[PDB]
Amino acid sequence: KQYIISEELISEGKWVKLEKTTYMDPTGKTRTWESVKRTTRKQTADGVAVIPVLQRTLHYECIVLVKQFRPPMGGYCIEFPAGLIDDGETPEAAALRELEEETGYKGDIAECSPAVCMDPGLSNCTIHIVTVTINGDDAENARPKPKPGDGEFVEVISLPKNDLLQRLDALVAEEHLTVDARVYSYALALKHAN
């Protein structure tokens, strides 16, 4: 019933563009929408986000997260490790690479989502969500070496999977941080399950 008729560039930055989208509503009335897109896409998706499950024997299983200054938020956020997929990179390879660069950990692919939307009322942005295990007892993960690109500044925070939501709430309460909505959603379902 619904579909795009045309797009009009409103403004294109180096990294972000703002469009005016004309679409057919399901009555047959024509309507307009203000949409954002990244100018970086080729790609299955703009990005990957990594769910990293740190497995060490005789310890709680942890989910490995990153804290970083996010200029659009004007603040520090807590997020899954994540970045854009390089032209001609697979989502899985992007994941293992972003995970290493942001956390120093070397992990294994457990599963990989289709392209999922970030904020579909605003943007066309999409990611692959990639579940990765990290064998924390392996020598390559003993003193994980985080190799960040130019200008990345990333603090690693590992939290126990079985208390993740309470742990995230405490961080928010003490530290004036913003937790990411995917992180929060995953943490909520951990509590809601069964």
Next chain:
Amino acid sequence: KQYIISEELISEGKWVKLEKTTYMDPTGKTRTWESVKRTTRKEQTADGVAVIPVLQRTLHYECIVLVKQFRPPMGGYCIEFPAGLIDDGETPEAAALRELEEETGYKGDIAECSPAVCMDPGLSNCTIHIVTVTINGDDAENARPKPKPGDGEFVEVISLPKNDLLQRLDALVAEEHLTVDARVYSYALALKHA
């Protein structure tokens, strides 16, 4: 360590604006970043709410109530938690209950309400509260629930069993072109991982 220096408008639409943000990096160097914001954000704790609606009925498995809509930024249909913008002066809880009834017909009961969480913090300042709501599906109010779509709103309801949510989302995606929302997929993945 890091902070915003200045935010310079690049282009303002009716609903979204694009800004050059100038910030202090943790080396002491000035850097820039293009950032998206809503135009309308007033005194709300966030732009929006998304509702995790747990439909409970005697001798049924619990369902998660989801919505399917055309999303002009995506150019296609998306499957999401029911969601909408917080009206000026409205509480996240009232906005969540209202949006759930408008989009699905159900009348829910508040269970919990998250802090403001970021939607895509590398891109925008957008935030929501994630509000968990239980729906008493045995109540007559919720028997033949009629959606009250707003002007230009056109929503289908999809209720999927909590205990098989991810497999049921995969089956929907395998059957048509649509995109699952990243917070929905994250929630479904955590229900599997727990």
